[PDB]
Amino acid sequence: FLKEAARKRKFHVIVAECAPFCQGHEMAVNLSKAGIETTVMTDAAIFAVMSRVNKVIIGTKTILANGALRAVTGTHTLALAAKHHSTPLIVCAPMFKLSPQFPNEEDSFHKFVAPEEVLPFTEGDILEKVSVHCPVFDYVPPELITLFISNIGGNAPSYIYRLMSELYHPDDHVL
Amino acid sequence: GSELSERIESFVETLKRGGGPRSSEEMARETLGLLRQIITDHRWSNAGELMELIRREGRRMTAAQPSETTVGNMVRRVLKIIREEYGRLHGYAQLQSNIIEAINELLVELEGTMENIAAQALEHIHSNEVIMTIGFSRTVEAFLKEAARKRKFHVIVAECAPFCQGHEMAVNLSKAGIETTVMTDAAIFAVMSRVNKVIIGTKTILANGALRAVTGTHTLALAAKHHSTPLIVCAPMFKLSPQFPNEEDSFHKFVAPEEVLPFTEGDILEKVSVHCPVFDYVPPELITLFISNIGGNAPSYIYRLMSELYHPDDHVL
Amino acid sequence: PPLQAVLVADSFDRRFFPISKDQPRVLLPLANVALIDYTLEFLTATGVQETFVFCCWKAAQIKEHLLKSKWCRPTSLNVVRIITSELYRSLGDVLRDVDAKALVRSDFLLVYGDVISNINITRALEEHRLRRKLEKNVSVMTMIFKESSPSHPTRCHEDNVVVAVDSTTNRVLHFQKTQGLRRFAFPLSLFQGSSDGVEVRYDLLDCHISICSPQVAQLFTDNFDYQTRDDFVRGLLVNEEILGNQIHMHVTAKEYGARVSNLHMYSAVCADVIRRWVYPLTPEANFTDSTTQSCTHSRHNIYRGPEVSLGHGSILEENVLLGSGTVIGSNCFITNSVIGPGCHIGDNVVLDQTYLWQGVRVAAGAQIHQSLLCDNAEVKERVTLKPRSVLTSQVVVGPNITLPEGSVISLHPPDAEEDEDDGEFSD
Amino acid sequence: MEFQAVVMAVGLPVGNKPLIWYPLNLLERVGFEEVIVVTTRDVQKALCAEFKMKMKPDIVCIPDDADMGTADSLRYIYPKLKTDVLVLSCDLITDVALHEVVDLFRAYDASLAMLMRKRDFIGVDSTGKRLLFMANEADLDEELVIKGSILQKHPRIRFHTGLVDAHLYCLKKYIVDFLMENGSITSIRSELIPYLVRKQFSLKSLDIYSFIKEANTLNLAPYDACWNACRGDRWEDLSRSSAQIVSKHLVGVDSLIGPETQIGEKSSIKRSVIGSSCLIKDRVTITNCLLMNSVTVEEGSNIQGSVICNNAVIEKGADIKDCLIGSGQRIEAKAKRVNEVIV
Amino acid sequence: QVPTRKDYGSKVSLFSHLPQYSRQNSLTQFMSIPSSVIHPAMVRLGLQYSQGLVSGSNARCIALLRALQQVIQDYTTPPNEELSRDLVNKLKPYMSFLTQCRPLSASMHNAIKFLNKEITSVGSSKREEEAKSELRAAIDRYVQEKIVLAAQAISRFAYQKISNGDVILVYGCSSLVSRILQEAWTEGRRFRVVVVDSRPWLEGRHTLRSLVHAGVPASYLLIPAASYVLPEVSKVLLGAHALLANGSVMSRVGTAQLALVARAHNVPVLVCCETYKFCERVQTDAFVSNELDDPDDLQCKRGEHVALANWQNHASLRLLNLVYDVTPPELVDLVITELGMIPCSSVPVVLRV
């Protein structure tokens, strides 16, 4: 999306990096390999920089039957920020990232990965009483997004629960 | 003696109708001159008698054009100063000269509040930025072409409609190479998404930060509460008043309806009850950061400042 | 140099009858404020320090109101000299006096008895003095006119004026009234006299605030036929051969200048002073210094004097005024009206676009629209009226007595279209 | 096409070039590929070919009978016409932006657009386009009886008394049809326009628009204005002596003569507009005027301020000033009066 | 052969890509007046689009379609050519020229698209004249059903949501609100409009007139003071000179701001829009597509002087005045289209399927 919509213009791309294990960093290298003015930052100061940002393009993992997608971690706090500064949330998800379940259907809706990436084993004794959570998928609510860039065009969080019936069936929710 | 009364009547008259003194600085300044005149050229045995006298004259000066309180709060501060000097000399002989020297202190401070604000400016602005104001205040234009000689931002001024007053600023600031863009007030929100902060003036700062500004700013305060871009309220400290928002809403200044709907319109003026207010109230909670000749402050410090300057008893004036 | 200004305290086409028999046309409280005060305030603001009020019809009362008023007090920056003379009854007589008694240095305004305005003539006055001294006394009177549109409810059939003015010099090349006329007439050789292009013009409300040089009274007293400024300018504009001395003009954009000549234009300018069209003139400013007129201006122009105490559940639509000490009835309905100081009101009474005045009293049940009620016009129950249904001076109306449109009723048998009573008969 | 390249003029091909070519190349320059023409009408029916000698190989035209009014000529030419019409005059030498005229015609759909370049006093709109009451002086007695309506409609009527017209009218087809229905009028410029502009008042309105101008004007047998119009167009018409052999020997002073430019000396002329096919190279004094083609000069002719016509051989120290030595007078040793010499 | 109208002074930072045109160099100066290139009906349409005589959405679409009727039913076909090819090929420059002389609103775009589909419908099946008169009848049935019947059904709908005793509020020459308020006053249903307005194209005068000439006790006050009336404006009834996919109502620059102050003041909103202004695109900000007009009209005769007479001689004064902004669907509390009183969040589906 960006490195095609930025071979005409040149502008500000503030790539946060996923703190559990840096994910946006190869993103930044790949973007900069065309010179797009990419600024990498640690995901803990978004509410600092959010007020000098215009369009919030977030890449998501999958969507739901509310529009309330769940994406790479730290996107829910980015959504709370980018609504506290009322910027748009220009999601970019093709069709096949859309599953007709509902938000509170999965016990541990997230996907906890090995806490070894949050407090590596080489730490020591303090690893005896530390519940080192690591939920690498966070759950955006419905009302924080505004504009799905699906590969049919733009859409809104209330032209999704019909993309179900246009793509799936009612009784394939449980599969 | 009668020269007192004649300059009083001249002041009251040019208050009721007279355009100019332009900068509220100048209104307060000629008010202070008249205050000195009253407070040297009259008779009073006790100081409380002068309290009562100046209270009478301030009551008349404010109930003349209650839409303007710079003169009213100047009267209230002078009454505070007489309270001060009487307390100092009670816990009577020459306190007159003490009054006059304190007033001269007040006046020399007033004459420099604008440069205080100017010097305080540059700690809030930095390049690659876009700033939005409204209307026209001398304080704000001083602010901006002060911060302009160090770096070149992009100011976006929204011309008020009842008077293209902001227009003037947009010319003035264009005479510092400052990237001024003039937008029609309606279109505020249309560009509210690319204004990193707003700088608004006032003509009053009521007793809870609920300023009262040129019309077309409550919309600005709300569109900047929305985007959470901040309101730099560049209000020199002397613009306060110990009055509170909800008071009989003879609060705006309903200017002649010729500004909106010209008289040459025609017959339709039979029942078209036109309106034209030039003062939009603004509530506190939208106000982010006050500036003043003391420094920076929060809309909660304004009550401290009001209990500071104006002795809380003379709010009825 | 100074600027004296004459206030001709009565124009001399006596029309407000029987209104002009209880109190003069100038003592008329437009909005609880004698017209004389609006005139004097216009004078004081526009730059005047020197006024002379030549009062004719019961001038004693115009004085007794004026002397104890503001300007006649020494604290005024505008000197008023009540030059009273019950001798004459034509405006030309006033002009001939100010000629013979040498009461002008130069540039003395001429204002009628009741002009309502807030015009700043400083631009007009500057151009006046300029073209005077820059063309050596050729000018006589520099007229000032308010841009309007031919149907605004102020300029009615009475004084719809028509001008033929130049483009740059702004002199009145031609002039005529249109009260009962449907065509127009000019000389072609006049347009030869202006080859750059004359301009006929019809969108000018006449402010009656044309600035008068001393040469005005000069060229006036030479004749006797001239007896109204209209006649004056007609003469100056027909004698375009021998020293015509073109009357000059100037059109204004913003400020509002009109004259309460007739009850229709009176109601128009009342409901247009209420609507703030003449800021600062608006009764909350109380430019007439008196605390019996503290108009605590409210939302929707619902004015309210001190100590009002209106009724119970009574929508006041807009433009309402309420004089001091009044009282309104429950489930009343006022709109666009004006009430008077200390004037009772009854229960279940609608008052649309009316104009009550001082002392009046309306008991329950009545319904009044577009009318007027002069002083102390006590009224019984269950009474309706019609557009322009004036009355005057204590004429109690009996119950269940509907009146048609021009229902002018008062004490006068042969002038008022009925007689004073407490029913609708028994002269 | 939807527009019409029609012309209208009576009473000719004098001047630099024939009086007809200038509107022709005007039109063919401002679009108007085809060019409709109404030719000789005076007494004959044969000068069409003599008008057919224009460099542009496109011409459509008719000759006619002795006397025909302009309204009469238009009702006459009604048959072969089918659309929006644009009447012009061979007697108008202007470089106007006519596109603006048809602009103010089309944008507002006014029934008729006229042009007037600074008799003929008009009363026009408060904003400069929609004329309201036009006439000439001798039309109405002494007054301007302005119908109270049109002042109730534009309470600021701005006038134009010191102004001359141009006679170039774009007329909607339906007014052409209604005119053809009516067989009383004869003159466009006199009685067509005021008829419309008076019936404009009393939805469908027959709006009519006027365009003021300060560029160029029309000319008749008093070509006095035409000589100076051609003075300007000699700055214009070369791209809007001149186009011939250029010798630069004698006094060519803002002058222009066609081919056969006799190369001689001892001759002079100022503020001149000369013609071609002339045996004028020998000694002569100034002219200080314009003149048609086919002239001659010899033995120090002291001509002045007049018109040297076509097909003449005049020479030998003459004395003339403000006297028309035109068609049918040519001698050598003669001093002419300074008054109006009919020749 | 199609010239362009050059820029006018200096744009704004974000709008170096948006267009900004001048109200004086209408291309009708440098086109051969007997326009054998563009049908003079189309040129007349473009021109009287420039000067701003016809303004509103409905009005502009009616004008475009009347010009298309006027040219089509007088179109001439070339031989050895298919109608639905030769027509659109002979037509594309006309739409290009119209865009040049003035941008195309949403209504006009959807009208052009409908006409393109309708032209693709007909073919050599009929001879030229048959399909031609057919196209004409089709355009006329469009002009009927999509706007006139639209206004009718929308008035019948909104007549439910106007209570006897309240007020309403409007914004500018939105034809539908004029019709709604009028027809809602004829049925004995009392209210009291309070129009607002903006500069430069002060247009609220239009609805103000059209109301008082029909007995609607209106009131007028400029838009920056609108935030004073809302303590009493018991509804809000905006127009919508466009509609977009995500419920982002694109309208005149004041509607969004007004709706925002209305939301914050706690009074309902009700846009009104028929069902062809739904352009099939989406826009989330007020900058990706707007139209800067001839900007030299901001200057006011305030006091004695035009405050910017030398608008362009300053090196760094740049004036914008947008025509449309895009109010977001968090604020649009209704969309009264003829398909129903659909709330704005559910518009991406109704008007699309």
Author numbering:
A (entry chain D): 177 to 351
B (entry chain C): 8 to 98, 126 to 351
C (entry chain I): 41 to 467
D (entry chain F): 1 to 11, 28 to 134, 155 to 238, 258 to 295, 342 to 444
E (entry chain G): 166 to 518
Q: Any passages from the paper?
A:
It has two catalytic sites, each comprised of the bipartite ε-subunit whose two domains embrace the nucleotide-binding eIF2γ enforcing a conformation that favors GDP dissociation and exchange with GTP. When eIF2 is phosphorylated, the phosphorylated eIF2α-NTD (P-eIF2α-NTD) engages eIF2B at an alternative site, between the α- and δ-subunits of eIF2B (Adomavicius et al., 2019; Gordiyenko et al., 2019; Kashiwagi et al., 2019; Kenner et al., 2019): a catalytically nonproductive binding mode that inhibits eIF2B’s nucleotide exchange activity (Kashiwagi et al., 2019).
Simultaneous binding of eIF2(αP) to both regulatory sites deforms the ISRIB-binding pocket. The first relates to changes imposed on the regulatory cleft of eIF2B by binding of the P-eIF2α-NTD between the α- and δ-subunits of eIF2B. Such changes appear to be enforced cooperatively by binding of two molecules of the P-eIF2α-NTD at both regulatory sites of eIF2B. ISRIB is expected to be especially antagonistic toward engagement of a second eIF2(αP) trimer, hence discouraging eIF2B from assuming its most inhibited conformation.
